[PDB]
Amino acid sequence: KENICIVFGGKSAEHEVSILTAQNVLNAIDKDKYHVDIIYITNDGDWRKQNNITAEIKSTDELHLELEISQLLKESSSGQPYDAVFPLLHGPNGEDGTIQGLFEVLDVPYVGNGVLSAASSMDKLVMKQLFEHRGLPQLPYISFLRSEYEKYEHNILKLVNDKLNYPVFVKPANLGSSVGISKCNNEAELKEGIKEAFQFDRKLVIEQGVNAREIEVAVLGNDYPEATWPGEVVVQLQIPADLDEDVQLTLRNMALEAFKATDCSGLVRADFFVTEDNQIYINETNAMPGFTAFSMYPKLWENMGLSYPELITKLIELAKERHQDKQKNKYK
Amino acid sequence: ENICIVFGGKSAEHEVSILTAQNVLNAIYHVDIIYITNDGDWRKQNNITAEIKSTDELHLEISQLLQPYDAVFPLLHGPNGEDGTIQGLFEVLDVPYVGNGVLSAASSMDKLVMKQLFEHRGLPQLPYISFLRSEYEKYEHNILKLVNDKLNYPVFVKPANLGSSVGISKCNNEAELKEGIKEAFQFDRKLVIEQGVNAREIEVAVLGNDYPEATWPGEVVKDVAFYDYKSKYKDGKVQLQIPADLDEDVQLTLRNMALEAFKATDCSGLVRADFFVTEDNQIYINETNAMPGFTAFSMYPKLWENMGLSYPELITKLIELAKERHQDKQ
Numbered sequence: 211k212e213n214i215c216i217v218f219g220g221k222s223a224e225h226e227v228s229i230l231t232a233q234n235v236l237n238a239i240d241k242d243k244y245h246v247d248i249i250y251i252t253n254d255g256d257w258r259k260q261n262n263i264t265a266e267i268k269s270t271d272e273l274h275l276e277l278e279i280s281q282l283l284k285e286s287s288s289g290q291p292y293d294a295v296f297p298l299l300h301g302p303n304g305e306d307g308t309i310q311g312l313f314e315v316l317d318v319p320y321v322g323n324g325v326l327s328a329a330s331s332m333d334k335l336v337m338k339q340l341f342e343h344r345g346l347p348q349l350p351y352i353s354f355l356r357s358e359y360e361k362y363e364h365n366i367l368k369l370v371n372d373k374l375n376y377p378v379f380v381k382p383a384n385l386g387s388s389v390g391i392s393k394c395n396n397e398a399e400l401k402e403g404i405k406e407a408f409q410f411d412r413k414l415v416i417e418q419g420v421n422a423r424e425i426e427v428a429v430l431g432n433d434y435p436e437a438t439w440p441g442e443v444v445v446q447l448q449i450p451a452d453l454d455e456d457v458q459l460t461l462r463n464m465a466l467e468a469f470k471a472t473d474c475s476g477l478v479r480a481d482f483f484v485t486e487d488n489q490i491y492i493n494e495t496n497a498m499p500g501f502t503a504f505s506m507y508p509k510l511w512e513n514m515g516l517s518y519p520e521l522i523t524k525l526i527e528l529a530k531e532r533h534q535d536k537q538k539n540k541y542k
Numbered sequence: 543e544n545i546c547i548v549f550g551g552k553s554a555e556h557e558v559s560i561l562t563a564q565n566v567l568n569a570i571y572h573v574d575i576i577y578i579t580n581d582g583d584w585r586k587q588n589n590i591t592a593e594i595k596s597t598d599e600l601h602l603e604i605s606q607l608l609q610p611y612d613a614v615f616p617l618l619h620g621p622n623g624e625d626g627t628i629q630g631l632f633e634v635l636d637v638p639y640v641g642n643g644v645l646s647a648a649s650s651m652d653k654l655v656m657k658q659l660f661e662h663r664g665l666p667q668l669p670y671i672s673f674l675r676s677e678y679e680k681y682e683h684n685i686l687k688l689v690n691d692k693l694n695y696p697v698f699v700k701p702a703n704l705g706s707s708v709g710i711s712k713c714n715n716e717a718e719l720k721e722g723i724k725e726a727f728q729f730d731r732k733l734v735i736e737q738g739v740n741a742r743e744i745e746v747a748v749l750g751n752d753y754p755e756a757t758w759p760g761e762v763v764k765d766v767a768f769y770d771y772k773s774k775y776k777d778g779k780v781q782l783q784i785p786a787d788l789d790e791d792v793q794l795t796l797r798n799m800a801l802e803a804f805k806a807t808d809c810s811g812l813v814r815a816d817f818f819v820t821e822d823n824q825i826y827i828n829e830t831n832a833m834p835g836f837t838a839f840s841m842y843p844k845l846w847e848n849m850g851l852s853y854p855e856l857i858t859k860l861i862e863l864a865k866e867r868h869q870d871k872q
């Protein structure tokens with residue numbers, strides 16, 4: 211058997227769905243193939259651990275678990291070091307690169323994106339700037355800092371009025387999912403949206419609004435990633451999405467380009483806007499997308515013939531490969 | 543107030559981090575130090591009341607190693623310290639720290655991401671190419687032909703995430719380029735190859751959080767063209783000049799470029815911007831460094847001394863910026 215550790219919970223608003231995700235992942239892992247330990251991070255930051263999961267998780271209640279951090283991750287309960295650590299955290303303090311940096315300092319192998327890819331895909335501005343260098347189409351947008359807005363509010367609003375068309379969307383640069391995002395139908399709502407998002411962040415983006423369908427593509431791999439056929443979020447899903455053949459192939463190639471633009475590893479989900487006349491814009495990539503048994507990312511791969519337990523195993527094997535390829539770097 | 547100095551690191555710049563730590567300790571508070579060996583082992587020594595006489599005497603649970611400290615001051619160079627990794631550990635433990643955050647340290651260490659962000663900011667750069675080890679094995683031929691068609695010999699092959707000129711080689715033709723690529727791949731999975739330029743090498747120091755300030759530029763006056771590892775730390779044939787012999791408008795251009803490069807990676811605390819200036823007065827930016835060296839051969843402290851900010855004041859100012867940034871997070 212191989213030794214795996216699941217990390218879930220976290221100082222997050224999505225604390226409960228991370229626990230729900232852990233139940234689906236734990237119940238999908240073949241216990242005869244993997245020795246499984248779990249680490250539960252409470253809403254206060256305390257780390258708690260339970261050893262050797264051998265039965266099915268019957269309720270999300272029993273995953274609420276009620277030693278130092280380096281000791282919990284260093285050794286499996288079998289005594290050996292873990293072969294892979296699978297974090298299932300969402301939002302800030304989870305997919306922002308911090309816990310990945312902790313994994314790197316402690317030299318533990320882990321599933322998913324690394325420090326650079328997680329942090330660059332989290333920051334809305336950096337994400338768009340790397341997409342633009344790659345040549346990916348994006349909606350017109352403006353960005354500025356809180357310091358600049360305190361002094362140049364008049365000039366910033368004049369640029370928005372000229373370059374963009376209403377409605378517009380105001381988004382904080384480094385916050386959680388749908389946290390501080392406001393659709394603004396006039397300039398009065400625009401200024402109120404800027405004040406709301408600056409109350410918790412120092413950097414802002416303002417996007418041109420678009421009338422389009424939301425199409426998503428799932429990517430899996432390290433150095434030779436593969437993309438799925440696209441799906442749509444009608445939350446109800448439609449897999450595969452009803453698209454023209456040339457749009458389906460364009461989106462799969464763009465998802466591979468977005469994966470490379472942020473130097474991703476393991477997985478990513480590329481979300482697009484597709485209008486009625488087949489105009490394509492990339493919205494964002496998700497370093498740790500929804501991973502429940504009914505989420506879009508696993509269902510997109512099920513349509514490709516990859517089952518949920520096989521997807522979990524493939525991500526673990528990618529974690530081992532990325533760790534091995536890191537050791538062959540010289541550091542002396 | 544209690545400060546903790548972290549130095550060493552699992553990095554090819556290990557010895558440089560030790561030399562940087564000696565001067566920061568000798569010029570700086572209740573001071574504790576943590577020595578990370580070249581293999582990644584943490585070793586702590588409490589209370590440095592006396593003066594550090596040699597680099598040799600600095601060859602000495604992580605959560606318990608970190609009254610709690612008012613600020614932790616990392617002096618790590620290169621991977622596993624200057625690339626966002628140890629900054630993420632500080633974030634999880636909710637401990638204030640000096641310098642750049644997770645994203646800023648990571649995006650400035652990776653020279654490819656750095657160049658792409660500098661390009662979007664509008665900064666001038668030399669023509670370059672980048673590729674992964676996986677791509678070079680399946681596409682070696684057209685990659686070497688892309689160097690011939692897009693770049694111009696001589697070229698400089700570099701690992702993406704390193705410093706102190708480790709892994710860099712100047713290649714005058716395709717035969718030397720193929721050896722430089724094989725050598726650079728020993729340090730990283732990703733490379734950058736730049737068109738070479740004949741130019742003077744100028745550096746500018748930046749300091750601050752939401753309102754950074756930049757110094758006057760200085761020049762690395764040298765006889766050799768390649769400022770390699772031996773030229774940087776092994777012998778004193780190279781002389782620094784602060785400020786540099788440049789026109790007033792050229793010096794002001796370099797300050798404004800350093801501020802834009804600081805903001806291009808959303809820097810916090812400090813950064814050092816390095817430039818190339820040709821004989822016909824053309825300007826390219828080379829790189830920025832999230833934690834520049836503080837060795838006797840370094841320039842970041844000397845650049846701020848010329849501004850009237852002495853060495854002990856520079857250390858204190860960096861600690862204040864760390865406490866300010868931490869309070870804004872909480």
Ligand SMILES: Nc1ncnc2c1ncn2[C@@H]1O[C@H](COP(=O)(O)OP(=O)(O)OP(=O)(O)O)[C@@H](O)[C@H]1O
Pocket residue numbers: 668698700704705706707708710736737738739740743767768769770816828829831
């Ligand atoms: N395109 C180029 N043209 C001419 N010289 C170059 C070029 N690229 C690199 N060099 C030489 O290599 C040296 C190091 O370059 P670079 O800044 O890329 O490496 P580094 O290790 O990041 O530097 P540092 O030690 O400051 O971190 C420079 O001082 C310069 O002399």
Ligand SMILES: Nc1ncnc2c1ncn2[C@@H]1O[C@H](COP(=O)(O)OP(=O)(O)O)[C@@H](O)[C@H]1O
Pocket residue numbers: 349379381386387388389391417418419420421424493494
């Ligand atoms: N420019 C836009 N035009 C139309 N709808 C948008 C635009 N930007 C965001 N939205 C809507 O807002 C939702 C959240 O936007 P997104 O940037 O994905 O937030 P997050 O990254 O926090 O999930 C999306 O599902 C989308 O439907």
Ligand SMILES: [K+]
Pocket residue numbers: 331332494495496497
């Ligand atoms: K994102």
Ligand SMILES: [K+]
Pocket residue numbers: 650651652829830831832
């Ligand atoms: K750098």
Ligand SMILES: [K+]
Pocket residue numbers: 694695696
């Ligand atoms: K030539």
Ligand SMILES: [K+]
Pocket residue numbers: 816828829
């Ligand atoms: K340099």
Ligand SMILES: [Mg+2]
Pocket residue numbers: 481494
């Ligand atoms: Mg979204």
Ligand SMILES: [Mg+2]
Pocket residue numbers: 704705706829830831
């Ligand atoms: Mg450097």
